[PDB]
Design a binder for this molecule. Structure first.
Ligand SMILES: NC(=O)c1ccc[n+]([C@@H]2O[C@H](COP(=O)([O-])OP(=O)(O)OC[C@H]3O[C@@H](n4cnc5c(N)ncnc54)[C@H](O)[C@@H]3O)[C@@H](O)[C@H]2O)c1
Ligand SMILES: NC(=O)c1ccc[n+]([C@@H]2O[C@H](COP(=O)([O-])OP(=O)(O)OC[C@H]3O[C@@H](n4cnc5c(N)ncnc54)[C@H](O)[C@@H]3O)[C@@H](O)[C@H]2O)c1
Ligand SMILES: [Zn+2]
Ligand SMILES: [Zn+2]
Ligand SMILES: [Zn+2]
Ligand SMILES: [Zn+2]
Lengths: 374, 374
């Protein structure tokens, strides 16, 4: 029995930037009021977790990272009403409190209880449930999935179908939903349109899936790693271009290819230059560009606002625009109903102990998603 | 009769940046095929005409500026089918060719035949209809309304109601339509929302009118010239704020005032800094900001894309998003049916010969719109 007791378990601790994860024993406190302790089953390696290592994405260290995952509830704190022990769940890196102005807005999803804007790396109550070698360890986005057990706030967990395959649906916790929603909800890609997708990793492939679902006629993948092209075509790209193959800037290439600019463009990398390029390549009077990638902390881009004055729309979003707790279970149900595919995103499956190897696969260009199994 | 003949008339020629207009005789060629020569009746002084003087808006010199006007057709070239001699007309600074991909798109209005993006200062055929002192003079936006007579391409003129009061409806040729459409068409302001409007000149006042028409609950006018506040309130502002009165940046003030950010913001000035401030003051997850102001040529702004990644939408537009030739006659009909007011924009009236005094009135902060009568 573990309910009400501290659990000692293995986690991947990041003690400082630019170091391998350290796989070692941590102590996980029991859940307090309105908290949920989860036994992890599978977690994906998202580029954002690597951004924590590289210092691209700032959050308090030391930390237990990981945010794209699925597990089974081990215990619940007082007052919890939306999940029970034994339920399959996905942790929600964007909460859904249901009560703030954003949660009440028809479009909004970036709940004001999030820990992304100004990261504290705690539970909602400002404390941590993790200790390692006697030291407190920070949480990450209210999730912290690189651990056999984590504790999350109730507003940061969704109950999902008891029959779902957790080694696949963990991707609904971040990369799939982000990319798919960026196309279908944020951009609202139209039938017959031309899309350009910058970055052909797990998120960008999920953008392609959304553009195809929305009926785009042309979906142009853009990546500097041509090894990414074959899979991009399998999931719906009609053409792929590598900017390094061209003498001219790729915005000019894409404008030419699309006979004056694309309908929808997506930045799914995290570079300031590609954000401006992606905006520029959409048609100047009616084009829409969506920023998805997370760029280096504290860095500003430079752009000419004439790009907007002509008529372009520029937007960004977190988690594909989906209200997290409402959307995650529906997306799992949609997966179980064969409405989209997750296998094309999964290139590697490793035990959790091989987390560093999984990160090396990402960094080398070789993987899309590695799924770590506990 | 003057049909087929060169007309000698007075125009305001701008020979050099940062100098007064020179009111002197020009020669106006007769219209070629698919061209229309117009006897001007009234023209407004828009800030964009001053931007030509100041070099903020680059267009070839020497030039006949003016783009917000109404007149009566003097003669038509071969093949013209949409207007006849004697018709009241408004020149269209954004053409509507009807044939390009933008004109065919449901949302687009920045027709590819425009002379705004890369100005040539000519008719569609690349030539000029104006000479002064024996020297060919450039056109401006295909309109050149600071002249007793002008020649425009047929795609750059709309026929309007024969009973239209031209000394009022000239404002439909630029400032009214721009501001109004920016609110009702581009932003799509919703009932009960909170709007912030930066800049309370003719265009900003027209944005306020559109936000009021859309049913906004709060419309916060922002201007460094507090003399602009009274009229802003008259046309619908619920509150006005002067950034100079505050020790904190106005984005912070506006976020506080709106309990977490406004629903819709509009930059109606032309400054890079206020474009970034206006974006920032809209709610981070679901806010929309529209750039309307024209900023100094070739200058880039600097911004942190996290402002977009949280969920904001940033867009700009020319002419309020309106397809010009379809919309102008309908806007005039709406004016004639008292659906909106133009008198609140008209603070001064002068004869055309006093154009330089009209620009002085604008530059001093004293006027909204001065209407010049021929
Ligand atoms: N907005 C969100 O809610 C959200 C959620 C998930 C991921 N993210 C972000 O989305 C981005 C993509 O994540 P991912 O997991 O798919 O990453 P990834 O690393 O698997 O894919 C990025 C792709 O970009 C390509 N690339 C890198 N530099 C490039 C360049 N200069 N030009 C063209 N292509 C380039 C790479 O070759 C790679 O294929 C990351 O920045 C991540 O942090 C955002
Ligand atoms: N997008 C379009 O199609 C379109 C068409 C018309 C006008 N324009 C542009 O819209 C803008 C407004 O035109 P207008 O005729 O109303 O001009 P205007 O000069 O009458 O009004 C601008 C207002 O901005 C205020 N202002 C100036 N600097 C400010 C600052 N730093 N902070 C706050 N307020 C400030 C002024 O006091 C003034 O009242 C101009 O840049 C013009 O070129 C664009
Ligand atoms: Zn909330
Ligand atoms: Zn992620
Ligand atoms: Zn104007
Ligand atoms: Zn056109």
């Amino acid at each position: 029995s573990t309910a009400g007791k501290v659990i000692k378990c293995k986690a991947a601790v990041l003690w400082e930037e630019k170091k391998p994860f350290s796989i070692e024993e941590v102590e996980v406190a029991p859940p307090k009021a309105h908290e949920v302790r989860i036994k992890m089953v599978a977690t994906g390696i998202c580029r954002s977790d690597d951004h924590v290592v590289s210092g691209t994405l700032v959050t308090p260290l030391p930390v237990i990272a990981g945010h794209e995952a699925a597990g089974i509830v081990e215990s619940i704190g007082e007052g919890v009403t939306t999940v029970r022990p034994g339920d399959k769940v996905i942790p929600l890196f964007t909460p859904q409190c249901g009560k703030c102005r954003v949660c009440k807005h028809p479009e909004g999803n970036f709940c004001l209880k999030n820990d992304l804007s100004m990261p504290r790396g705690t539970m909602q109550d400002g404390t941590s449930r993790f200790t390692c070698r006697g030291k407190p360890i920070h949480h990450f986005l209210g999730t912290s999935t690189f651990s056999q057990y984590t504790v999350v706030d109730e507003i940061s967990v969704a109950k999902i179908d008891a029959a779902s395959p957790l080694e696949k649906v963990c991707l609904i916790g971040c990369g799939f939903s982000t990319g798919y929603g960026s196309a279908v909800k944020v951009a609202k890609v139209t039938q017959g349109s031309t899309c350009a997708v910058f970055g052909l990793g797990g998120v960008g492939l999920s953008v392609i899936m959304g553009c195809k679902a929305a009926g785009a006629a042309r979906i142009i993948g853009v990546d500097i790693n041509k090894d990414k092209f074959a899979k991009a075509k399998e999931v719906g790209a009609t053409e792929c271009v590598n900017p390094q193959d061209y003498k001219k800037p790729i915005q000019e290439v894409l404008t030419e290819m699309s006979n004056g600019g694309v309908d929808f463009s997506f930045e799914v990398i995290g570079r300031l230059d590609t954000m401006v390029t992606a905006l520029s390549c959409c048609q100047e009077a009616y084009g829409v560009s969506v920023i998805v990638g997370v760029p280096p902390d504290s860095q500003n881009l430079s752009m000419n606002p004439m790009l907007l004055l002509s008529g372009r729309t520029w937007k960004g979003a977190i988690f594909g625009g989906f209200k997290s707790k409402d959307s995650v279970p529906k997306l799992v149900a949609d997966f179980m109903a064969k409405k989209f595919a997750l296998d094309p995103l999964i290139t590697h499956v490793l035990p959790f102990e091989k987390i560093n190897e999984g990160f090396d696969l990402l960094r080398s260009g070789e993987s899309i998603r590695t799924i770590l199994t506990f």
